[PDB]
Structure formats: C-alpha cells, structure tokens
Design an enzyme around this catalytic site. Sequence first.
Site, mmCIF file in Angstrom:
data_model
loop_
_atom_site.group_PDB
_atom_site.id
_atom_site.type_symbol
_atom_site.label_atom_id
_atom_site.label_comp_id
_atom_site.label_asym_id
_atom_site.label_seq_id
_atom_site.Cartn_x
_atom_site.Cartn_y
_atom_site.Cartn_z
ATOM 1 N N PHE A 1 -10.201 -3.527 10.521
ATOM 2 C CA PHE A 1 -11.161 -3.609 8.978
ATOM 3 C C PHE A 1 -10.712 -4.026 8.066
ATOM 4 C CE2 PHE A 1 -9.622 0.618 9.656
ATOM 5 C CZ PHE A 1 -9.581 1.058 8.596
ATOM 6 N N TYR B 1 0.469 -0.855 0.320
ATOM 7 C CA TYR B 1 -0.008 -0.057 -0.368
ATOM 8 C C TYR B 1 1.142 1.203 -0.081
ATOM 9 C CZ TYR B 1 -4.325 -3.148 -0.140
ATOM 10 O OH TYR B 1 -5.553 -3.986 -0.644
#
Lengths: 391, 391, 391, 391
Positions: B391, B119
């Site tokens: 999450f 990322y």
Amino acid sequence: VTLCSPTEDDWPGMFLLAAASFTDFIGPESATAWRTLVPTDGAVVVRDSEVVGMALYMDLRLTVPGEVVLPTAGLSFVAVAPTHRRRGLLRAMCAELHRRIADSGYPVAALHASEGGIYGRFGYGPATTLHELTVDRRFARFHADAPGGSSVRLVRPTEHRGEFEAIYERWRQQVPGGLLRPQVLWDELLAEAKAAPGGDRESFALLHPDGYALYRVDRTDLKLARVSELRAVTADAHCALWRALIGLDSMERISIITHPQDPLPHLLTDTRLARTTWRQDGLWLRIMNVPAALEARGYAHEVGEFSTVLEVSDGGRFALKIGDGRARCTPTDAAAEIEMDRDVLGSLYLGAHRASTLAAANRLRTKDSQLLRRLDAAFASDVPVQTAFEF
Amino acid sequence: VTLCSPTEDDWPGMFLLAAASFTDFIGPESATAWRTLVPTDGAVVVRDSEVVGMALYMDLRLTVPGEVVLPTAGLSFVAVAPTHRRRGLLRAMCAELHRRIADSGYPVAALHASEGGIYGRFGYGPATTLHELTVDRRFARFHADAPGGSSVRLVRPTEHRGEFEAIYERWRQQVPGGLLRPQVLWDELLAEAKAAPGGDRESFALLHPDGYALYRVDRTDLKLARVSELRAVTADAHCALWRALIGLDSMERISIITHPQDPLPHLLTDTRLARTTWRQDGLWLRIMNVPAALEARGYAHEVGEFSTVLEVSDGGRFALKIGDGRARCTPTDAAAEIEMDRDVLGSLYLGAHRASTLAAANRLRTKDSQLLRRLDAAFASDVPVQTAFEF
Amino acid sequence: VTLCSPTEDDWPGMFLLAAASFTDFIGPESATAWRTLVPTDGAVVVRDSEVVGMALYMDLRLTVPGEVVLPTAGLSFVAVAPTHRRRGLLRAMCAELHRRIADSGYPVAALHASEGGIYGRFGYGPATTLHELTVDRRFARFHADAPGGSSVRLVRPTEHRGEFEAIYERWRQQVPGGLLRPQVLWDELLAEAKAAPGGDRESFALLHPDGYALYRVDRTDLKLARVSELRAVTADAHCALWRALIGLDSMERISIITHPQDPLPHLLTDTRLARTTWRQDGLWLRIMNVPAALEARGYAHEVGEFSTVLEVSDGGRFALKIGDGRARCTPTDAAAEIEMDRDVLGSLYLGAHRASTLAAANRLRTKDSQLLRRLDAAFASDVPVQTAFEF
Amino acid sequence: VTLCSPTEDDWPGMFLLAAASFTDFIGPESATAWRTLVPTDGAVVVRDSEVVGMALYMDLRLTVPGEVVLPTAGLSFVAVAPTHRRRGLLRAMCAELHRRIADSGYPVAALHASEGGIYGRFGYGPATTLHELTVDRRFARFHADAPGGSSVRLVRPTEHRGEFEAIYERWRQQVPGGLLRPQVLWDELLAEAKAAPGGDRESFALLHPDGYALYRVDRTDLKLARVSELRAVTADAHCALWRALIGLDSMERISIITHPQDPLPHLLTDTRLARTTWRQDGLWLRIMNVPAALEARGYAHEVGEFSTVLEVSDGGRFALKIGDGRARCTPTDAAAEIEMDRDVLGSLYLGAHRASTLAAANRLRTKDSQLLRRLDAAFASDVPVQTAFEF
C-alpha cells in the site's frame, strides 16, 4: 568391483579421479595438507584394475551450542567415476565409512554437499546457511549509533599469521559451526593469498586486535572486492572492519559469504544497501549417536523444564528431558510424542532451522503444538550459527 | 509554501504529482478504491498556486503476535515535486500527519518504503522481510514425508471471489503482518487478474478448501510463472497448492514473494531447488504509543516472568514486566536497563528481527546479556511474520 | 520505370512503400501533418503499375550563424522498394528533386540520413552533431557556482501549448540549426506526449519562463528518464531545468540527445557524471547556390579582413572576401587557393566541423596554413550549432 | 599522524599501500622506472607506525599552444589507506606538495584523475578530452580524396625502438598535451609489448617514416584490435597507418583512445563507421603561477589586440593584454572584467574547453559578451590538444 582401504599404490588413481571430478583440484600437492587430517582407516576406494570410487573422512572439532566442542568426522573427497554411475558405489562407500565412524566413537559426521538432493537419504541434514551480502559501498553511510565513529591496519596476510591464528581460535570456540583450523590449513590459506598468473589477484588483510578480514579484488570485475573471510570476536571489531572495507574507495561493491544474522545491514543508515545476492545450505550434519549428541549440546535457559519421547526413524526411541540448559536422553519403549528422520535432527541441531518450520513440511510429526513451541525455543542458539571453512 | 488538508479542487494536482512520481499510477481511477480508506483529515498537501507535496494515511487493521488486531495508520501517496527537493516538505508533511495519527488514537503507523534510507529518521523500522523463491520445477520432486502424496482446482479468479475473500480473512487474522483487505481492494485485485494489451497476461487461480494461489505467466519470459499471492491456512493446503504449481509442466521456473520461514524448500528432496533470488524489507512500523503497543501484543509463554526498564529515545522511559505471554508497561524515572530509538522497537515488534542482532549493531544498548536473551525469546512470534499486500 | 509528380491516386502506394521502409510509419494519418509542408511539385514517384520509389521535400526555415533564417528544402520520405535496388532510382529521384529545388530558389537543402554512406555523393555533408548525455543522478551535486542555488513547474504538456510554442520560437531564431516548427508539428508532438497501450509512457513537462524540458520514463527501463526535448533561451533556465531533472528521485539515470557544447557537465562538482553514451551526425546540408549561401551567413568579427579564391568541385570558382562579419562571393577564373567537394562546404557551413580537421583528411585542399587558420576562425559560430527536430 | 618526506625505510609501506590502492600496480619493480622521475623532496608520506597516506610528483615537460614546453609537476601515486578516510590526509598531502611545487618554480602541475569529483577543489581543471573511436572495419572504405590511394611496415616493436623514440619526440614537441617520454618509460612501454601468460596478447607495430601505431588483439574479444598508441606527424602518415589497420582482415573492430578532432571519420565514405564509444577527461592542470603560465603560451593571431582585467579566485587580479599571439599579464587593483576559480583557467589553458561554454555554466563570470568571444578565439589552439601518456 571390491571396496578396500587404499594402499599408497592407490593414491595416483585417487588423484586422477579427483582431478576429473573436482574443478578446484589442481594436482597431488592439492591433497598433502588435507591428507594429514585423514586418520588410519579413514579412506575407502572401489577398484574395478583401476580406482572407480573413493570417499574419506577427516578428524575435525566442531563447536555446537553452549560452546561445546565435538569430535566430528568430516566426509570429503567423495567421487564415483563417470564410467560407474548408478551401480550402488556411493551407497556402499557411505555405508562402510558410517560403520567405521560410528565404531570409532564419533557422535556426529559432517560434510559440504556438491548438490542438495544426494545426502538427505544417508541421514545428513543442512545445519548452517550461507548468505552472500553485496554492499554498494558508494552509498553506504554508518548509522549515528554504529560503534567506532584507527584500530584497524591494512597488512600483508603472510606477515601476521600468528595474529590471524589467535583471533580465529577465539572465534571458533565461541560460535556454533566453528571448526578448529590446524596448522596445515593455515599454510594452504596463506599460499592462496598470493597472486597467480591467469588466476586470483593478491589478497590483503584488515587487522584489529579482536578481528580480521581477508579480501581480494575480483579477477574480472575490477570494481568488486570479495571478502574471503571475516572473523570478529567483538561487535567493535566487526564494525571497525566494515568501516575499513567501506573505505575501499576504488571499489563499487564489497561481497562476503556470511550468515543470516550478520548485523552489517543495521550498521548503515540504509539497511537495503546490504543486498542478499545468494543463499545456500552450508555445513550438513549426520547425528551418528542420538543420545550422545543431544546430551552434549547446551539448550536455551528461557524454556522451563519439559519431557517428551522422541523417535528418530531407524535411530532409536528416547525419553528426552530438557531443563536448566541441559538434556537427558534415555532409551524408552513408551509411545513417541515426536517423530523425525535422522536428517531432520541434524538440521535442528545447531539452531539454523526451527522445529515448527520442519513440522509445517511434515518432516517432524507431533500432535502437540505446545511441544513444538518448546522444542523451537530449547534448540535455539543464543550465538547465531556460522559456517567455518569448506572441506 | 503552505501545508493544508486538500479540498476536492486539490485532487487533480495530487493526481498529476502521483503520475509523475509513481510508475504504477495509471490515472485518477487508479486512486478511487484506495481513497475510500483515507479518513476525513487523513491527507495533507503543500501548495506553492500548484501542488508540490502530498502525503496521506489509510485506516488499516494489522495483526500482531497473539492474533491481536490493531487499528493502524497506513502512510501512502507520499511525494515531493522534483522542483521542490531539499526544502523540508517531507519533514513538514510527516510531522503534521504523525500529530493527526497520534491525536486520533492509533497506536501504530505503517508504510512500504520506496528506498531504505528515508523513514528510519521519522521513527519507522523495517518489521517484515520479503524473500523471493524461484523453483526450477523441472527437477522438483516432493519428499516422501510431504503431505498429499486432487483437492485443488484450476479456476478463473473472478468466478470464485467469495472463496478467496473467506480464505484470506482466516489467514489475515492468524498471521502477524496480516491486513484486513476491504471490498474495494478485492475489486482492484480481480481487475488486475485480466490480461491487458501490451501488459500482463491473464491470471489463473489454484483453489483448495483451505488456500489459494493466484499466478500468471511472465510478460516476456514465457517459461516463468509468477505467483502474485499464495494464502494457505493449513500445511495440507500449502503443500497441495505447491504440488499443483510444480505441475505447470509448460514452465521452467515458478517465482513467489514469500517470507523467510516458508516451508516450501523442506517439501522437496532437494531443498536447494527453492533458490532465494531476492530479499528486501517489507512492511515498516512506527510505534506511535509505546505502552499501548507493547501491552497489546502477546509474548512467548516459554520465557519466565521478568521486569526491566526500557527507554525509547524521545519516546518515554517505562518499567516493562513480561509474564504469562502478557506485558505491563508503566511510566518510571528509574535508571534504564535497555535503550533504543523508536525505529528499533518497530523492527522488534512483530518478531522479524532479534534484539541480540540489533544489539550487535549497537542499535539497542544494554549491559545485561541475560536481559537480551530474555527479550529475544519474549518478542519472538510462534507464527512467522508475513507481509499481506503493499500500500 | 517512369519518374512523375504523384497524383492523389499514387498516395496509397506511397504509404505502402512507407510502412515497409520506415518502422516509425504507423499508417496514412502518420503523414497528414507533414504533407501540409510539402509544396506543389515537392514530390516525385517512380512507377513500374505500382510505386517502387518516392522522395519529397518540405518547405523549412533554418537558422544559420548570425541569426539569419534561410528558406530550406528538407528532403524526406525517400524510399526504394526492396524489389528495385541497384537500378539507379535513388540517383534519378535526387537529380530531379535537386533540379526543382535549385529552380525554385532555395539556397540550401537539408536531410537526416538513415545511414552515413549514402548522401555525401549527392553533395550533402553532416552539419550538426548529436551527443547523448546520460547522467547518474544519484551522485549529481551542483557546483557552488551553478545558477539558481522554484521558477520551474511540473506540468501536463497539453495544458501549456502556448508557452512551449513561444519559448521554442525564441530558441529557434537564436541558435544555428534552429527550425521553425509549424502548428501541425506541435499537434503531432503533443499527441505523442500521451501514453499508448504497449507503447510509450505519458510525457511530463518542466516549465520555466525561459525554457522547458519534455521527458518520459523509459518503456522497459523504469529507472531511466529520457528527455525528448529541452529548449532554454537563458543560462538560468538551462540550469533551473537540470536542477528539477536531477530532482527525479525515483530515477537512477537521465538521458538527453543534446549537442557537444551543452554546459551541463560544468554545472556539476563531478563533470564525469554527464557521460557521453552516443554520438552521431544530425542534420546534413547540401549547399544548392554557393555564393547566395556564403553571403547570407554571418562570420566571426575576431578575424581580420581576408580574400581567397574558393573552388567547389562542379560548384563554381569564386573570389571570397570576408570582413566585418560579412562575406562577398563573386565569380572568378583566377587560380583557386582552396578546393573542396560541395559536401565539405555543407559540413563547414554551420560551424560544426573545422576547416583544419577536413584539411587533415584531404577533403579540403590548400597550400596555405594561414588561410586554413583564417577559415577555421571565420566559419566558427559564436552560438554553438544545435539540432532542432528530425524530419 | 605526521607528514614527512619518505626515507628508504618508508618505500615497502608505500608499495603495500600502492598494491592495495591501484589494480595496475603489480609490485616494487612496477615503480623503479617512474621513481627516477621523482625529484629529491618530490614525495610526502603520512605515518600513523605504518604508511597510511602518500603523494608525489614527477618532473615532466608539457607542450602548450605555440609549441612552448613548460616544466610541469606531474602528481601521481596519491593514496589514502581505507582505514584513514575522511581525516584530512589528502588535503594535508596536496597542500604540502603544492607548497613544494610553487617554491621549486613550476608554473603548472598536472595529473590524471581516478574520479571526476576530487581535484577541482584543489584547483585542477580537466584540460584534455579522451575520445574512444571503434571502427567496424568490415564496412570501412576510404574516400576518393583520402591520401595514399606501401610506405607502412608491420614490425616487432622491440626491434625499432630508435624509430618510435624519434617519431614521438617530433610529435610531442608539435602538439599541445605532448609530454617528453624519458628512456625509462620507453623501457616500460616495450616490456608491456610482450605477451603475458593469463594477460595481454603480443603487441605489433605499423611503422611509417612519419608515424607509428602499436596495437594488440583483445585478451577475450578475439575480433577486436586495440591500438594502444598512434603517433603521426603528417596527414599522409595518419592516413597510411589507418589504411594498414583497416587491412587487419581477421578483425571485426579496431578501437583507439584518441582526441575529439581526430580526422579518421573524414577518411571514410561513411563517417558514421568511426563510432564514439567512450569520452572522458584526460589530463588535468593546476595553474600554479597565473602570470607566468598565461605569458608562456602562444595565442591565436586572428584576434585583434585587446586588454581586460582577470581575477582568479584566491589567485590574484591581473591586467591581461593579448596581441600578435602573445599575452602580457601584470598585477592590478583595477575592477575585474572576468572572474573564475583557478580550476577553470586550467580547463581553458590548452584550448580543450571554450570560455563561452564555461560562462554558460557560470564557472567564468563577465558582463561583456564581446570579451567572451575574444577569449574564446584567443585561447583556441591551431593544433588540437591531445593526451600523451597516463601517469
């Protein structure tokens, strides 16, 4: 049971106690180099006759924030015979050495602790943090931003003693936690760089103008290289040395004992590859003279001038004024705004632990949260605190 | 290969991809609660027909330094079919969601990364740090200074939902890293508190007016208690909960995933008993709008007013002025004094990483060491950054 | 102690013995599908009353070299009660079933052995070899020559039963070792593809027009994917399926039970990444009728016509003539040029073991090394021998 | 960065690089014996000055199918400094040595690979297979057919040098993979047979007129005997030596690194007791002169005369005619019927890998399946390919 400075006649009994107490202590030649750092009257023994307890200090030079070097008493060789536990021998030896250290003029004492639960009650606080990083070098790729994308040479450590000595001397004067490493300890380090039958493999060195790494393959895990020491004075040197270590294509893993702010993980495209495998207290500090220690170190310039009253339990109450990176600590009977045990001050002193973290454990007590923020900021070190060498 | 917002017809194919990609994904009911947090147009799919890629964001509320709450796009459910690797599907899905997130007005996006090397190149920087502490509770003794030397109750989690909700709401508004936990996620948390045949043991709660701990015995190691969540608003609550956990006399060890400034080790006479067993990146942040993010957060009051010019690679060049805990960020063509990729800014943003550490890896470039000290101080958080929930 | 064909009244006692003898045997429904493959008079029991021994055979179809399909008696469900060991029950049950199998007209019997030291003495030889390959998929890169550099789909096994059935049917008719898989065994396979509470994770399928792979994540090692079955009819399918498996980016390792000539390692730039982690005998064969078995299979065309006299210990002496890929085996009293026990012939029969390897252990005796080279060549299989499914 | 033949002055720098690159390399005396096998101009070094790369070849004699002995260049001592990775040093050293080897007249080069992914791209193919067998000797019983049901003596290796030398010389001339072992390598082998403080236990020998086994108890696992070398010229010798090893009643396990056709498992009533615990590529081969190599080796007599056109990528196109165990390879511009990279030919050359296995990975390309069957048969070796000694 009597407590004395040892005579030459006491040293064979001290070396027997040492062999029985310390698994690293091979025999009497183990001690020769280190004994040259013990001053006259730096050692105590307890006799029952035979030697049932011992403790000493060495004369060290410790770098603290602001590149200030303090004379430091390094406590070492502390042992109680297994026959003489729970009889107050450790308390008696520590009280006598602390009297000698304080009377001799040392502002700080330091040690490396065999267990975490012993030295707090004698006023030592953990002041540096050891962080072991293990890199899976098979996946490691350097970030496009990393420096040096060779100035490094693979060398025999014994052939480059001069260059290691000079780089370490620059590093120890710049970094809090740095210790002067005298000639006798370089002799011992380079002797441990040799292979031993049944023991360690040969050590190799990576040498840059501005840093070095000393590493050896693990005795039993032949795909692990352990970096015993990496000293770099510039970012370019630190990155160039890690490029060379990640070039040990026969290894799977490279492990180092470093500090929590080591930039290594940020050099890689995957920061997660530099895994934290172990964390522990490194150097412990006992502040012997509160005002002399606080006045000696430099403080952060970013915090505006402020004044408070600090009380150290059984350590005095002082008016502390910090401004322009400097502190003035003077005796006062005014009400204390901050209170802490001596050990807590030692934990704060090199910037390794935040005042607000210690406050959340109630080890440091104040009713002013602004004062806590100001101490956190002022006691911070610009250069992250590292651990020099064990003693 | 086309990229679309999914229709209801796409969700069975998305749940097949999910099951094959995520070992925690049990089946379609796995997703119901989380789907209520996905806005209209919050999801993209790639079809080849069948679903070969997917990504979505959820609407979250993230606390940043100064107790400011930002609308945050939480990237989640990102998967590429094993049949469709190295075809640019991840790049295509991330570019489209980032366009939607930026157009919708979110100043920040966030995620939890499955691996560390993916990322960064999409502008996410690791912004929180997970620290696992394992305590050998058989030896643990509380320091004489520790608070609370019972306000804690052992309870069934399902019977005290209201009290957990209210304590967490106070905690998430005070701590950087805090996330609003909506009702549907409390439903899921309390459902996981149940024992499962072949799965987890029953969870218990320790409840204080100002904190709670949720813990369960390990499936296989019956002498290990794992604390899934500990939220404490006061130091007294944090210490009282740890006294109760150290009272689990049937356990040898208590493990928790916490943050690097957890005061636990300082509560004990032996700080070494709180061992760091694991460390990893937690929440990652992508700053979507540089000036809106920098202006929103509070900064340290200890640092005097200063101005600089910050350039974010492909993110704009801005005149940054920080004073009185606040920042003004305005467009400029003046020469940059500091330069960094977008991901680096996300790493700095909650105070988890120091500017001077990133500078030593050359991820942040400046020729002014004073400017570096000032950014380190200003970007610091008074309240240590924690990780809310995955999450 | 009497030996009989069981009545319906015997089956509860057989299922108790089964549960106590076989850890995979859950309960009576375990057996329903398999029982449909047991012919009338295919089962024997020993009663002491209660069931203290049992054995049966199933009606199978086995592919042998030359794509010839033989009726095969598959021995299974063999158990002696732990109360009745070393009383000749196994010998008695095997002698009776072998009488029934030979009288019924089967030219071969087959089994999977619980231990290696039992079935040789009853004339079974190991005839296939199981090779477990474990690939560290994080390093795996396909060679520039590898095919397919997507025709593969990730699917739910239960939704594509027809396509799996049709691919397997093509594969089993082409490969020596192939077994017809009847409808009831597809019912059982697809039922095991479901997740179980406390048991296996859900299975997924990779589907190509000309092959499939069925795989599941390991129960306990969540970074290992185990491929239960991979059937490919073309090289393109085999390579395309492995490209998809190496695309399981959440796994570290992919394991499969395959055969020694699996081309997988040659598909990768590093052949060493496909590591052999386990090797074992697979299917065992007992040749029931020597001339019918030898005449049925095809032989290598590369070897020129030759004649010999083969003696099987207690199996007859035959004049064997092999030419044009075919063999004529006729009774003779002429001196034997080759001699071996029945079990050795079963080991040679599908091409898994070389005559010259068996000769070097003295399991096959001849004074002619040219004859040995000719048998090695003739008994070789063009299509490598694989193992279908356990029974 | 320059590439040269080393002078005597270069060897200390080469031994430093060796020590840092190879965990088995003790020091300069490590190399003396092996250096006598390096011809004039057999070594290259790269200097940056200091030694940052090295490679050499030794003069060897390799047995190939048909008991033909080829002069072989054995590549060894290849290392690049960890400071100089990814700069083309390996490519430069391999190109120069290959030029010297080809110009000197060697038809083949060989090596043992430190990793599987390096040498394919330089035209080396794995040509032998190492199979580790571990026998649980507590259960091992010899089959009624096994030979020798004592001609073996337990002896001190140093006292029987003459007999080991003579048996090995017979074995290396008969087996493909066999290497001439010169006097200096017998000196080194017998020196390693001595116990070392902190290192290996003493080696013992089992001696038969027609074979020997050299074995030692494991350093740490005192119930494991490791057979370093077993050379047997007859089946009787091989069986008699294994009877003696299975008579090491103080051991639980006997391990050996052998080849895939070792008859050991067939000597036992339970073939499963000889467990395959490890499998790996052994010797790698680079065919330097395609026609000279193909003409030199013998081929299987069982295959009838056939002709084809073989193209080696960047290796020439040749008309290959194989009949009566011999091959004629002549230059042609006729269309190729078979195509493969040079490395593939090296994998086929000693019979360790089947042409049809390589074809199924598309490493060998033909449109004729009959031609594939004929090459598989012709390239097969009557005597299974073994690995002599590492270099």
